[PDB]
RNA sequence: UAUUAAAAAGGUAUUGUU
């Protein structure tokens, strides 16, 4: 047809008796409800009620997997620094004499690399939302 | 008491399909149209003559996962490969050329002929590979 | 059921002495680990089920111990036949699958990774202890001819004596209804088809006069029924003959 | 689009344009499998 | 699996091979030109800046004399195309069409390679770039200028030409989006209008 | 495209049209049609 | 009174506190010493321990040694929380594995990008781009590559920092490492 | 029977969502029932009528009644359709039959 | 120019069945499985590493042989193998007589340091993040025993250890005058925060102290009596 | 409300026959916002977008059929082709749902001893998809699902090409796969047109950004009047003008 | 309906059918870019790894010899299943066979009874490391549950793909530099 | 409002912590 069948022009479509006695549920699901996101208690990205849920419990460590903000090593400029025990112990804050060229050479790849890993994790959420997330419709199992 | 966020509108995970099974619409349109006060959809005029298959029960009722319910969605040469990567791909590099006889195939046939002629497993392996390399 | 230990539900289709699967004092179900192979940790394992689906293959027949001749007893068959998928050397339906509450009841401790009444009554040991020490300068029982009794059913056409005829990986002849008082004929009707299987292997399907008089009538009793589109007439050689109709 | 005028027009045009008879390969053109004019090969040939 | 005959640890200091392959050409060239790589024949031709096709065709009809006239040009194009990506031209395309057509119905069971070729045949039509444009329009890769050029191409039409180029039913979408088609398929900005000078 | 509001005037001059007709011809390949594109470049008052 | 050495007042310190036994070589901890590591010559003990502590942290062994040693919880709550952790770990293993099973697809896309570069730029060219040392015909420059790659392969001591241990007011847990309040 | 249920589009904003039940039937065989929730009387009526024409049901009236006791269980209401000599059921249920 | 026809005495080298063999041998060596899609530099490094370093009884016999397929897949050592892989004290401290065994007792709200000698002679009292101040009338209990105060106090402990322990060596009779470090065994009761930097403080003093062995002794509770109730249970 | 006009005879057919290429006329109406007396409007663009995405249902379906149905018989055989034609024909024209129609497809009757014929032709069961997609393009070009023919094939082809990049690019969670109660946002639909329009926004708000919610060059559908308008002047005024010819 | 591995609702794969790389790459194929395509060859049918547990709860670990060498006088083979402190690795972590766990608890707590294993610790740790499978250093066991490892590898091989791309774009920069420097 | 490249949370109240 021309529209999706899980919504009506007034909200979500009531299916069972619960929906018909409590029709708040059809038009309100958190401080981030929007008429496009109706009922779907995952709503947009970044807004409230957006987290994908893996079998009931919701997901909030999406970067903490890739290693952004979880276990930040990235090693590309890190090995460079740890190497330069001269320009690590100098006034540690110059384009100092020689090695701060190589420090920024490593970091130039760090930047592109972490942009690629971040886009990876963005596509990861946008995949795991398709083909794993129950959308919080199944009961918790983390307890 | 924290219940699952979207739980309230969850679907009944076992009986959410059954509304949609083609047999339900066959049973439910057969009478709607038998009444004589209805103009059957064009799909009924057809899937009446070709009713769906009988035994494609959903796994949600046949509580058996190992059961190949649907006939459509159904599903040695390991070493003939690990010994020659040209033997594998000889019709299948870009898209399995599924109508030309294949070297992996004829080497399986050769293998069995040899092992019934009585050559041990390992030696039929070598003789198959050497006969392939030769014909190459 | 929302009580714990009642989630197992009503399983009439088990084998147990109850229908209330939560009252069966026998096989307490491990809930976290099972289910990889059977659906849910409730349902019985696919090696103990008493009711079989359509496209799902039912149990395999435990062959004789050595399992050299389970392919030699299809020497009558097409030369190149593979191992039969419905045959098994070690199919035991009293094989207790491992449960964590049954055999590793961690209830009475801190559940600290080392504690637990691990019961080694169920799993076949992996130790070299056994195959090292229980090695003998004599031979094995299969040579000693220790074993009386052979096969429990006596003389089975796939394991003891050679299998003649065709294999029946369905049950199209097993679920066959006798259309004759002497049972020389058996029947198997679908909805629009009718399968008439001469059941007479002890005489190589050689029809007696009486049996042919009964068959002349069951054949046309089926090819005159109104819901008969096709009549598959054939021989139900139970593994005892290669003959269609002598 | 159209609530069915074009539907029933296409359908009458179809049933009046359906070809019947055996063709040079041994099948009514709507036999289950034996396709004719595959990729317009018959008008290809008749041009060429 | 590592494909057949494709050597992995092959270097340049590894001696040069003999097989006329795309890989062989590309690695020999890596030795030869040092670092020049062209995204097509026409990147090389924009680098050469005015050397036409015949301007190398004659060079090679001379360089190796047992070659015939057009065959010299062919060696030209082929070494280009083999150190590049093969070219999109009505020449190669009419070759493919005329040839597959003289080839005819095939012996793959379900006319399979014929259907592969025909799914290719209509993939390089205008209608494909027309619909590719319509699809991109549904995605908003464009800007105000694009909108305006579309509008004005519509304006330049007439009643008669609308009535005409509607009978193809994609013709008019191309008449309108024609500049947008050339954009979405053409990785180039004809427009960098430097500075107004009054 | 001509200017129809004094905004397009700001991105507009014939001497700039020159660099662009040159894009036209440098990308053009045959002289029988460089003929018509040069005909237009001279007919629209492009400051050659 | 008599405390186990994992109790808070283990080695009391005051006028009256007494520690039993000798403490040299063979100490009271002769059979109670978990992790000794012989120092290599000159190696930094700020590395030996900055590795020991990370291992005994990832192995959540310090989790437990802090936890059970402070407040002897109810077996019910100890089970509750330990089971809770086995279960939440069993959950996040589901997530980690979806991530891994995705990143291997992403990595296959990386390697297939590699094989588009390889089939437009040539495999040996690609090897040079990776550093296939063709212009270096000199075993000396080969030795230079040798040495740099081996000084890099013998990765220097990586100093993994162990997140600090937090003390909230009544010390609701001494598994506390960040200021999240946990389910007690 | 119409009703009224308060709908809370927000903590501060509440609407009166009238909730209709209705059954669109013709004893010629075909009858569905739809219940709806919508802010207004006529809009809830229309919504329920479209839900009913979605839930349309028919009946093989060749037997002009059930020929065996149908003991069903709707959403909490244990129903039993049985054969009688004549329609013997509630005023409402009887007008439905 | 480079005419094709000229180079021939090489172009029949191919169609000679001698080079057919010498190149089909290569093609066969190549058809095998390979686990390197491009030129890996660490694979090249591994190759060159060993390049630098280096600078019949048929089936019947083993059929009667019993322990064969056990020694085939055995993971235990085969042939004459070491005893440093069996002896109890392999990876164990080989102490001396003349060593100071310095304890780092880092508790939760205070982290003190002590030393003893191999006989258990206390060389000085328990220098404490409360005994040197740092603990009372301060920013709070939250930093009662963090890394900074522990480092400060172990630095103060070494401050006295150096003169004290050289005094004891003169007292017993080892005229260990100069250049010879103090042989230190660092016994660390830890997992807290006052140990993480205290280790740095003992490391700053390797220019006087050769730390021999570095061990942690944090007793673990297997089954020991109650610990004082917390707030919840 | 998406209420289609209830048709009639001559009069509705006059209004309906004199329609002409609605997709184009929508485009005309969208661009004409580039003329002097009009502005290019998102409402016009969205009427264009829906007049072009009208056949979303049939397209997402037939793509699912071609590419998610391991071993779909011989689709080029007129039997399964007729199953396909009749199902997709009733997937458009709304008489069937996507989910139920797909079940009708994967359940229609094909050939006896189906697994046994399959395990002879297919190793892992999942056949070649070219017969399938050729069948589906034939489907939508025999049924005039599109006014401009090449469009059918193009969408059928490109949606498939785009999905070919995803991880598990050919599995669909049966719930979200087609219509049901709870669905996915159209950027995340499977063979949909927005899945390539996948992006997001980027915001640097003023110190005072929520207050000025009208001050910018904002299009007003509902114009402010002094009763709600505190000091706002209008979307045309410019207090800080730059000199220019 | 959930899968077992982590709870997926689909069948984890990369390519199903024989064509789906060809159909994806058709126009390249009709212009003839897919005759030499090794990007359509290496990865025409690359399917994901055995990202699962072949024997989850560890019925096959250890190896049969290890049992017979798991006795009380065998701290050497004990300590190759205990933590650096003597702790067992929890069953979620090092899934052992139940018989192994039984023999191991009794073997450790009998060796500790007769004082032939340290009442706390792991005396055979580094010797034991040779048997314990060093995994997250260089080799990528695709069935790991560490995702930091997988991301190192996705980077490092994406590092190298970007390295091909960098080397060749800077060579093209060099070429356009040599253009004006050699002809003018 | 429990430091993700902004993201997960309860009510005995039913305009609902005055």
Automatic annotation (TrEMBL), chain C:
Kindly list the GO CC terms recorded for this protein. Answer: mitochondrion
Q: Which residues cross the membrane?
A: none
- GO biological-process terms attached to the record: fatty acid beta-oxidation
Q: Which domain of life is it from?
A: Eukaryota
Q: What is this protein called?
A: Enoyl-CoA hydratase/isomerase domain-containing protein
Q: Covered residues of the complete protein?
A: 51 to 296 of 1181
TrEMBL record, chain D:
Domain of life according to the entry = Eukaryota
Name of the protein: Uncharacterized protein
Which span of the parent protein is shown here?
1059 to 1106 of 1827
Automatic annotation (TrEMBL), chain H:
Q: Which GO terms describe its biological process?
A: translation
Record's Gene Ontology CC terms?
A: ribosome
Supply one GO molecular-function term. structural constituent of ribosome
Name this protein carries in UniProt = Small ribosomal subunit protein uS5 C-terminal domain-containing protein
Origin species, per record, is: Trypanosoma cruzi (strain CL Brener)
Coverage span on the entire protein? 146 to 242 of 434
UniProtKB/TrEMBL annotation, chain K:
Please tell me where this chain falls within the complete protein, as first and last residue plus total length: 55 to 238 of 319
The protein's name: Mitochondrial ribosomal protein S18
Q: Which domain of life is it from?
A: Eukaryota
